[PDB]
Every structure is written in structure tokens, then in C-alpha cells.
Amino acid sequence: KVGRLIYTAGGYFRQSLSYLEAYNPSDGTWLRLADLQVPRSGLAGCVVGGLLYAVGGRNNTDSSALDCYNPMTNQWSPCAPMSVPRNRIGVGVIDGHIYAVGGSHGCIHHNSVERYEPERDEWHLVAPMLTRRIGVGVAVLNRLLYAVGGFDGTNRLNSAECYYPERNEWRMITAMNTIRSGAGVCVLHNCIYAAGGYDGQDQLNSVERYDVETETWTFVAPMKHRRSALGITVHQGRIYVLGGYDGHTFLDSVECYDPDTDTWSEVTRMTSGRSGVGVAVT
Ligand SMILES: CCN1CCN(CCC(=O)Nc2ccc(S(=O)(=O)N(CC(N)=O)c3ccc(N(CC(N)=O)S(=O)(=O)c4ccc(OC)cc4)c4ccccc34)cc2)CC1
């Protein structure tokens, strides 16, 4: 069997893409899957019940689209769209529900947040963030959604806030050491990781993880390639970053961070360089 792959949807390189490819870290092999009905970039990926969802993005135009991919049918299926278009959206999953955080619709910078129930194919607004954030990293940890960095329309941000589903409220948390938009955010071993991003003048290769109990952000081993608008995911206790923009070119490099050795390896290259891809694991 081919159990658990890293899926990449959409992206940008000279134009919005429709590519859907999968990577087998047991293999080193790539798989070409069904193209997206509409090419998109700046979207987010997540998994719920073994289906892969592609949320938001822009087609070259800002998308409110939610689309479902079934790995067993290799087929894409449209879902109820969001209430608003959300370019540079962040996404997280709590109890089988997809939270769409922030993003832009043209020049509107959203601080709003909606929740999608796959059981009912319905979207509902939840409490809005304290800060408008596009290009925001999103991570779920102890059933709490975290919104990290991004751009509020005026300032690139280093702040972070925390949404509480049971109370339906947001609370700021400790700010990061660096301003980061278009960063990869994920959760590896009870910690939130924030890799790369763009600090307003440079693409970053730095990496800080947040310890919730100590409330502090500490830097860790940096990546080899500066990159923003990167895909990120966690597979078997390791972080994977995919593609992105380094300020000049569109990367195809996929680096793998080992927490037990605090080291970034290059483990493969995408079939072509791209940025703004959605990434998930199933
Ligand atoms: C128009 C005139 N020019 C001038 C220069 N050009 C340079 C050549 C070029 O094409 N770069 C390029 C790079 C990337 C894409 S993208 O697909 O990933 N993408 C598209 C999307 N869906 O919006 C996105 C763009 C910007 C983002 N950022 C958040 C933010 N507020 O900018 S960011 O922090 O990471 C950033 C900031 C400054 C940077 O340096 C300028 C580069 C990154 C995105 C964040 C998340 C997801 C997609 C993003 C697309 C194009 C091109 C065109």
C-alpha cells in the first residue's frame, strides 16, 4: 500500500496552477493526480475524513471556493463556498471542522473567520480576530486555533492570537521574535513552528517554535533556503516545507526538519518550482 502521502494543490509560477501532486517519503516518488478544475494559488490545504480540501486562493479572481478531492476516486468535487473570497487564507481543523482565517478580497483585509461543517456542507462565521491578517499561518493545538503573523493591510505582523472554540473568543499571545507574513505554521510535538516568511524587506530562513506553557518563542535550526509563500506539513514527526519564493526565483526544493537532531535536510524536489501551494497529509 501507499499509506499517507504529502499532497500539494495549486501554486504559482508565471501563472496560477492546477497541479495536484503527491509525494511518498517512503518512496522518494511523486504522483500526478487530477488537476484542479480552476487553477489557484495562495490557497490552503487540509484533510478531513480522508478527503483533501482546497480552500480559497486566487485565479489569475480572488476565490471563495471550497473543493474536495477524494483520493479513492481521484476526483474533485465543489463544496459550499465561503461567505467571502479569501486570498492568502490560513486554515485549521478542529473536530472535523475547517476554520478559514483571514485572507484578502482585493483590498479588503479580513479579520473575519468562518467554520465549515462537512456533515452539512455549510459555512458559519465565528468570532472575528482582533487583527486583520492575510498571509497568516494557522495551527491547531489542544483544540485551540492559533493565528500567527501575516499582513493587516498596513503592517507586516509579528503578533499572534489564539481562538477559543468553547468560548468563541480570541486572545492575543506572545509575539514572535520576527515579523513574518507568508510563513509556514504547523504543530510538531506539542509545539507551534513558524518557518520562513517575509519580514517586510527579506524572505526569511529563520525558524522559531512557540512553547505554550513557557509562552516564549525560541529560534531553532534555520532552513537552507530563504522562502515565503511556502507549503508546510507534518509527516511522521518531521516538518516538510515545499517550494515558495526566495525573493528572486520560485523554489522546487523540499526541506525536511528533524526535531530530534534540529537539522534541515533537502529530501527531494518538486517536478517544478512553485509557490502559494496548499499542502496536506493523508
Ligand atoms: C505586480 C508587479 N509585480 C512585481 C514583482 N513581482 C515579482 C515576481 C513574482 O511573481 N513574485 C510572486 C511571489 C509569490 C507569489 S504567490 O503565488 O505565492 N502569491 C499570490 C497570491 N495568491 O496572492 C502570494 C504573494 C505574496 C504573499 N505574501 C503576503 C503579502 N502581503 O505580500 S508574502 O509575505 O509571502 C511576500 C511578500 C513580498 C514578496 O516579495 C515581493 C514575496 C512574498 C503570499 C502569501 C501567501 C500566499 C501567497 C502569497 C506570486 C508572485 C511580480 C509582480
UniProtKB/Swiss-Prot annotation:
Family label: Belongs to the KEAP1 family.
Protein name listed in UniProt: Kelch-like ECH-associated protein 1
Subunit field text: Component of the BCR(KEAP1) E3 ubiquitin ligase complex, at least composed of 2 molecules of CUL3, 2 molecules of KEAP1, and RBX1. Interacts with NFE2L2/NRF2; the interaction is direct. Forms a ternary complex with NFE2L2/NRF2 and PGAM5. Interacts with (phosphorylated) SQSTM1/p62; the interaction is direct and inactivates the BCR(KEAP1) complex by sequestering it in inclusion bodies, promoting its degradation. Interacts with NFE2L1. Interacts with BPTF and PTMA. Interacts with MAP1LC3B. Interacts indirectly with ENC1. Interacts with SESN1 and SESN2. Interacts with HSP90AA1 and HSP90AB1. (Microbial infection) Interacts with ebolavirus protein VP24; this interaction activates transcription factor NFE2L2/NRF2 by blocking its interaction with KEAP1.
Effect annotated for changing F151A: Abolishes repression of NFE2L2/NRF2-dependent gene expression
Role description: Substrate-specific adapter of a BCR (BTB-CUL3-RBX1) E3 ubiquitin ligase complex that regulates the response to oxidative stress by targeting NFE2L2/NRF2 for ubiquitination. KEAP1 acts as a key sensor of oxidative and electrophilic stress: in normal conditions, the BCR(KEAP1) complex mediates ubiquitination and degradation of NFE2L2/NRF2, a transcription factor regulating expression of many cytoprotective genes.
Effect on the protein upon substituting G42C: In a lung adenocarcinoma cell line; also in NSCLC cell lines; strongly reduces interaction with NFE2L2/NRF2 and reduces repression of NFE2L2/NRF2-dependent gene expression
Part of the whole protein covered: 323 to 609 of 624
Effect of R156A: Loss of interaction with NFE2L2/NRF2. Abolishes repression of NFE2L2/NRF2-dependent gene expression. Loss of interaction with PGAM5. Does not affect interaction with SQSTM1/p62
Localization annotation: Cytoplasm; Nucleus
Effect of Y198A: Loss of interaction with NFE2L2/NRF2. Strongly reduces repression of NFE2L2/NRF2-dependent gene expression. Abolishes interaction with SQSTM1/p62
Feature type site, description Sensor for electrophilic agents: C107
Residues bearing PTM S-cGMP-cysteine: C107
Domain-level remarks: KEAP1 contains reactive cysteine residues that act as sensors for endogenously produced and exogenously encountered small molecules, which react with sulfhydryl groups and modify the cysteine sensors, leading to impair ability of the BCR(KEAP1) complex to ubiquitinate target proteins.
Tissue: Broadly expressed, with highest levels in skeletal muscle.
